[PDB]
């Protein structure tokens, strides 16, 4: 699963913040993903 940010959400980096993603298919229970994001530490950072 890949999320690409547009100019709206891109505007400044997630720091000292909770981010939540939820996937909800048409049958069965949804998957809820939550991370408190500290400062990013490299080109890619491991958040969860």
């Amino acid at each position: 699963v890949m999320i690409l940010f547009g100019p709206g959400e891109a505007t400044n980096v997630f720091q000292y913040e909770t981010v939540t993603i939820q996937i909800t298919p048409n049958i069965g229970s949804p998957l809820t993903i939550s991370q408190y994001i500290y400062q990013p530490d490299g080109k890619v950072t491991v958040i969860g």
């Binding site: 890949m2 939540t20 996937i23 909800t24 298919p25 049958i27 069965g28 229970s29 993903i33 490299g42």
Partner: protein, 98 residues
């Protein structure tokens, strides 16, 4: 005298009972199939789920950190029990930063 008027009412009452019989059986067949379908959908609902099955990766304009690029993660059906429909017309993915 009475061997005729009674026979007519008997005919009518038989037809009346047969009409209820017809409706009751049809509607029993209908409702029991709705129950069958529901039981199947209940089991599908209890079984089908996604697990997060990798780390969550986040990408930014490092080191400058003024701008956000993408997030990546990996998912799989939970405990290998059943398949998941992921068509984007039916499925939603929500994103919140409260």
């Amino acid at each position: 005298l009475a061997g005729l008027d009674t026979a007519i009412i008997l005919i009518a009452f038989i037809i009346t009972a047969a009409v209820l019989a017809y409706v009751a059986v049809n509607m029993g067949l209908f409702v029991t199939q709705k129950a069958k379908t529901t039981i199947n959908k209940g089991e599908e609902t209890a079984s089908t789920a996604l697990s997060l099955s990798g780390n969550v990766l986040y990408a930014v304009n490092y080191p400058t950190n003024t701008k956000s690029y993408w997030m990546y993660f990996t998912v799989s059906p939970s405990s290998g029990v059943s398949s998941v429909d992921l068509s984007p017309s039916t499925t939603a993915i929500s994103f919140t930063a409260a």
